[PDB]
Amino acid sequence: KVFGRCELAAAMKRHGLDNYRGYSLGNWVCAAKFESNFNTQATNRNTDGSTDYGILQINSRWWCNDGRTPGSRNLCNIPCSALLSSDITASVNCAKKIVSDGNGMNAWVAWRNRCKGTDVQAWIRGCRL
């Protein structure tokens, strides 16, 4: 599923991401834009052999099982395929655990490089929320 910007903002808000760990909703929308272009089916292979999955490009080295990332963990307790669903529940729950893990949203390199320090609220501007 390819979400609209405001559609995703509303879904993320319903699932409790606004202000989660102090990160306003715009941060999460910005992160999804630059990680996946709002596409739940996005997958990208990393040099280390792990793969990033879903709307927030959650990585198989730590967070989910894909059966092909040697030495990895599955801290979210899910198959990585769960992160590709049109229903973002799994991605949101897993993201809550990632962002709570010490480094905050810096876990998403695209957030750090493209959202951090910018007017992230612009990403939810005009949205009925």
Curated annotation (Swiss-Prot):
Q: What is its main location?
A: secreted
Please give the superkingdom of this protein's source. Eukaryota
* E.C. no: 3.2.1.17
Which controlled-vocabulary keywords does the entry list? Allergen, Antimicrobial, Bacteriolytic enzyme, Disulfide bond, Glycosidase, Hydrolase, Secreted, Signal
Spell out the molecular function terms from Gene Ontology: beta-N-acetylglucosaminidase activity; identical protein binding; lysozyme activity
Q: Key word Secreted present in the record?
A: yes
Give me the reactions it catalyses: Hydrolysis of (1->4)-beta-linkages between N-acetylmuramic acid and N-acetyl-D-glucosamine residues in a peptidoglycan and between N-acetyl-D-glucosamine residues in chitodextrins
Q: Which positions fall inside the C-type lysozyme domain? A: 1-129
Spell out the catalytic residues: 35, 52
> Which family, according to UniProt?
Belongs to the glycosyl hydrolase 22 family.
Would you tell me the protein name for this molecule?
Lysozyme C
Gene source species: Gallus gallus (Chicken)
The organism that produces this protein has a lineage beginning with:
Eukaryota, Metazoa, Chordata, Craniata, Vertebrata
Gene this protein is translated from: LYZ
